[PDB]
Design a protein around this ligand. Structure first.
Ligand SMILES: [Ca+2]
Ligand SMILES: [Ca+2]
Ligand SMILES: [Mg+2]
Ligand SMILES: [Mg+2]
Lengths: 290, 381, 92
C-alpha cells in the first residue's frame, strides 16, 4: 500500500535485498515492487517476490540521473505485474538523444514472471512484458520462465530488447500460454533499436505468432536452440523471423508453426543453419579468409 | 501466593504479548496444556511459547490473524500425548474448508509423536496427521520450525478439505493456499514427505532441511505435488530420502507447473531431482496438459543411492525428467566416491518429455554406470 | 504502587536491554509515545519494543550505533497519528 515504490535504492552501493515481498501499491504511476533507481550500484537481489505492481523489478534512472549499474538478481518471483523485469534509462532511448554512459552490467538468474498484465492501468496503460531491456549494455539472463493461463492479458510482445540496448544474453527461456501475443521474443530494429544479442536454448509453448523476431538494421544477433509449439496459437506465422539476413541461426525446431524460419523474406520451412563471415571447417591451418 | 502477584504483573506487561503459561500451560512434558493454547489464541493477542515440552491431547487449531512465536527449536517444544487418537494434524488452521488469513509461526519444535502408534505407520487418508497443515490459507509465514517424528508430512501446504482432491488433469482445485513463506525449517522422521505443497500457488521454500523419512514408499525430502504452481525453492537441503526434490502429480491430478529451483543440495537420495507425471508416461496414455515449466540452477547431487530400498528398489538418479515440457537446468554437479551405488543411468530424459535444456553439467565418479546422460528413445521417449 | 517496584526490578535486569515502556511508552493505540522512544535511543542502550500499537506524532530519528529490535511483525507496531503533518518519514 505504498505511494511510489515498495523497496528502493538511490545513489548508494553494496546492498543485499533478500527474501522480501513488495506488493499492491496504492497508486498507478511508476509503482514498482522493487526499484533500483538513480545512482544505484553493486546491488544483489535474491529470492524476493513482487505482486500487483507496475514493474516487478525495475533497474533504471531518470534523464538527469546516472543509471543503476552492476546489479545482480539471484532469483525472483514476479506475480501479476505489468513489466515483471523492466530495465531502462529514461532520456537515453531516442535516436537523437545522447548515449547513456552509466547503464551497464545486469546479471539475472531464475527469473519467474507470472500472469503479466495491466488491469489496474499503470503508466497510461503501458503494454505488459515478462522482460523489457532498454539503453543498457551487458545484460545476462540465465533461466527465465514466463507463464500465463489468460492469453488476453499480454498481446503485444512477451520479451523485448530495445531503445539503444546492446550486449544482451538470453539463455534458457521458457515462455508459455502467450498464445495471443504477436511476438514471443522481439529484438526491435529501426532507428534506435537493440543489437548484439544472444538468444539460446529457448522453448516457446504456444507463445507468440512470431516466435523470435529480429528487426531491421540489426548487425549482430545469435539464435541457437529454439523450439516452439504453436498448435494452440491464434494464427501463428514463424518460429523464428528475421527481416535481414545477418543474424546467425542453428538448432531450430517446431511443431504447429507454418514456417520454422523466415529470413530476409524467404521461408526455410524445416529450419536453417546460418553462419556469416569468414568460414573454416575440418582444416589443419589456414591463411587469410575473406 | 506472593509469586502469583509478581507473575500477574509480568502477564500484563506483555513483553512478547500474552504468554501461553498465563492461560495455565505447564510445559513439563506430562501436563495436557491444550486448553491453555486455545484460550491464548482466541484472545486476539500474539501468543508466546517459553521453554518446555508442551503436551497436547488434540490438534491445535489456528484462526485468522494469529501470531505464534516460541523460544526456538528444541526449546519451545509442542508434542502429542501418548494417547491421542487418529485423524488430526498436530498444528493446523481452524477453517479447514475455506481457510484462514495472516498466520505467523516462528521458532518452535513440533514433535508429532508417531512413536506412540508403533513401527511403520503413516496418515490414515488425505492431508490428515502432519506436524503442520495449512489448508486454503492466504499469507502464511513459517519460520524456524523443527518437525520431528511425523505421521504424515512435516509441513504440508494444500487447498481446502481434509482429503486431497482428484478432479482429473487440466483442472484447478477450489480454495487454494496463496502467499506462503517457509524459511529455516527442518523436517525429519516423517511418513510421507518432509515439506510438501498441493493445489496451491505463490510459495517460497527457503533454507530448509528435510531428511531421513521413517518409511520406504514415495518418501521425498521436498515434494511439489498435485495442482501446485508458482513455487520457488532456494538453498534447501535433502538427505536419505527417495527424491531430493520431486515435482510431480498423480494420474487424476494436474501436474505441478511453473516451479523454480534457485540452488539445492541433495545428499544420499535415490533420485535427487525427479520430475514426472504419473499416468502420462506410457505411449497409449493421454498427454499431460499440465506438466510445464521447470527452471533449476546450482543443483548438487551427492552420492545418489538406494541402500534403503525406496520404491521397490528403484534405480538411483542424479536427475530424471519425465512427461514435462520446458525444463531448464543451469549448473548441475553430481558427485560420488562409490561407483557401485549407481549403475544404470546418471541423468535421464524420458517418458514423453520435451523441450529440455541441460547446461553446465559436471558428473564425476560414476565410473560403473552404463550412461552418464541418456535421452531415452523408443515408443514413449 | 507495588507493581511499580516489580517493574523497576525488571527494567534493571535488561533482558533485551532497555524496554521502550521503561521510558513511558503505552502502546495502546491512542497515546503519543514519541518522547519515550527519543529518550530510549539517546540512552546508548539497545531499545526493545514489546507488544502494542505505539502511536507517534513526529518521525523517529535514529543516531549512530542504534539497536532497535521489536517483538515481531503485527506484534510490535509503530504508527503515525491521525493528525501528523507533512514532510517526515515514519522512521529515518
Ligand atoms: Ca517509481
Ligand atoms: Ca510422497
Ligand atoms: Mg525512485
Ligand atoms: Mg503428495
Amino acid at each position: 500500500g505504498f505511494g511510489d515504490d515498495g523497496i528502493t535504492t538511490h545513489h548508494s552501493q553494496y546492498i543485499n535485498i533478500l527474501n522480501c515481498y513488495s506488493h499492491d501499491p496504492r497508486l498507478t504511476a511508476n509503482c514498482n515492487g522493487f526499484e533500483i533507481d538513480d545512482g544505484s550500484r553493486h546491488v544483489v537481489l535474491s529470492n524476493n517476490r513482487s505482486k500487483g505492481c507496475y514493474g516487478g523489478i525495475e533497474i533504471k534512472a531518470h534523464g538527469d540521473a546516472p543509471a543503476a549499474y552492476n546489479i545482480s538478481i539471484n532469483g525472483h518471483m514476479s506475480v501479476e505485474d505489468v513489466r515483471s523485469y523492466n530495465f531502462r534509462h529514461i532520456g537515453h532511448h531516442a535516436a537523437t538523444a545522447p548515449q547513456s554512459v552509466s547503464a551497464k552490467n545486469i546479471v539475472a538468474s531464475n527469473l519467474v514472471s507470472i500472469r503479466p498484465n495491466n488491469k489496474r492501468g499503470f503508466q497510461d496503460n503501458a503494454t505488459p512484458r515478462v522482460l523489457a531491456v532498454s539503453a543498457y549494455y551487458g545484460v545476462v539472463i540465465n533461466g527465465l520462465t514466463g507463464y500465463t493461463d489468460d492469453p488476453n492479458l499480454l498481446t503485444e510482445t512477451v520479451v523485448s530488447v530495445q531503445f539503444r540496448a546492446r550486449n544482451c544474453s538470453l539463455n534458457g527461456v521458457v515462455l508459455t500460454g502467450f498464445s495471443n501475443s504477436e511476438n514471443g521474443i522481439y529484438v526491435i530494429g529501426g532507428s534506435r533499436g537493440g543489437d548484439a544479442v544472444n538468444i539460446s536454448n529457448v522453448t516457446l509453448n504456444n507463445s507468440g505468432r512470431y516466435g523470435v523476431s529480429i528487426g531491421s538494421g540489426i548487425e549482430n544477433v545469435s539464435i541457437t536452440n529454439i523450439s516452439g509449439i504453436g498448435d494452440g496459437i491464434n494464427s501463428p506465422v514463424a518460429l523464428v523471423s528475421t527481416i535481414n539476413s545477418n543474424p546467425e541461426i542453428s538448432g531450430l525446431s517446431s511443431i504447429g508453426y507454418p514456417t520454422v524460419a523466415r529470413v530476409a523474406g524467404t521461408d526455410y520451412n524445416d529450419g536453417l543453419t546460418l553462419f556469416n563471415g569468414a568460414f573454416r571447417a575440418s582444416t589443419t591451418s589456414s591463411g587469410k579468409i575473406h | 501466593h506472593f509469586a502469583d502477584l509478581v507473575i500477574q504483573v509480568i502477564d500484563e506487561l506483555k513483553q512478547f504479548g500474552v504468554s501461553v503459561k498465563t492461560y495455565g500451560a505447564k510445559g513439563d512434558g506430562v501436563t495436557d496444556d491444550i486448553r491453555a493454547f486455545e484460550k491464548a489464541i482466541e484472545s486476539g493477542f500474539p501468543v508466546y511459547v517459553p521453554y518446555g515440552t508442551f503436551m497436547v491431547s488434540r490438534g491445535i487449531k489456528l484462526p485468522s490473524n494469529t501470531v505464534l512465536t516460541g523460544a526456538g527449536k528444541r526449546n519451545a517444544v509442542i508434542r502429542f500425548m501418548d494417547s491421542v487418537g487418529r485423524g488430526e494434524s498436530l498444528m493446523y488452521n481452524e477453517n479447514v474448508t475455506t481457510g484462514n488469513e495472516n498466520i505467523f509461526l516462528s521458532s518452535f519444535t513440533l514433535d508429532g509423536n508417531n512413536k506412540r502408534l508403533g513401527q511403520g505407520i503413516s496418515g490414515i487418508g488425505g492431508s490428515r496427521e502432519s506436524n503442520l497443515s495449512i489448508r486454503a490459507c492466504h499469507n502464511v509465514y513459517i519460520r524456524d520450525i523443527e518437525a520431528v517424528d511425523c505421521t504424515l508430512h512435516g509441513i504440508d501446504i494444500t487447498c481446502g478439505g481434509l482429503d486431497y482432491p482428484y478432479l482429473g488433469d487440466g483442472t484447478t482445485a477450489p480454495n487454494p493456499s496463496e502467499n506462503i513463506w517457509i524459511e529455516n525449517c527442518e523436517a525429519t522422521g516423517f511418513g510421507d514427505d518432509g515439506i510438501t505443497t498441493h493445489h496451491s500457488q505463490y510459495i517460497n521454500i527457503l533454507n530448509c532441511y528435510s531428511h531421513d523419512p521413517r518409511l520406504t514408499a514415495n518418501c521425498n525430502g521436498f515434494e511439489i505435488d498435485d495442482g501446485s504452481r508458482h513455487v520457488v525453492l532456494s538453498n534447501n537441503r535433502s538427505k536419505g530420502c527417495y527424491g531430493g526434490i520431486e515435482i510431480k502429480a498423480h494420474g487424476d491430478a494436474p501436474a505441478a507447473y511453473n516451479i523454480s529451483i534457485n540452488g539445492h543440495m541433495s545428499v544420499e537420495d535415490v533420485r535427487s531431482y525427479n520430475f514426472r507425471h504419473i499416468g502420462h508416461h506410457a505411449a497409449t496414455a493421454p498427454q499431460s496438459v499440465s506438466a510445464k515449466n521447470i527452471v533449476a540452477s546450482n543443483l548438487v547431487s551427492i552420492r545418489p543411492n538406494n541402500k534403503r530400498g525406496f520404491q521397490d528398489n528403484a534405480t538411483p538418479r542424479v536427475l530424471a525428467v519425465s512427461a514435462y515440457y520446458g525444463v531448464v537446468i543451469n549448473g548441475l554437479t553430481g558427485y560420488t566416491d562409490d561407483p557401485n551405488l549407481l549403475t544404470e543411468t546418471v541423468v535421464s530424459v524420458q517418458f514423453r518429455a520435451r523441450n529440455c535444456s541441460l547446461n553446465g553439467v559436471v558428473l564425476t565418479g560414476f565410473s560403473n554406470s552404463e550412461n552418464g546422460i541418456y535421452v531415452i528413445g523408443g515408443s514413449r521417449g
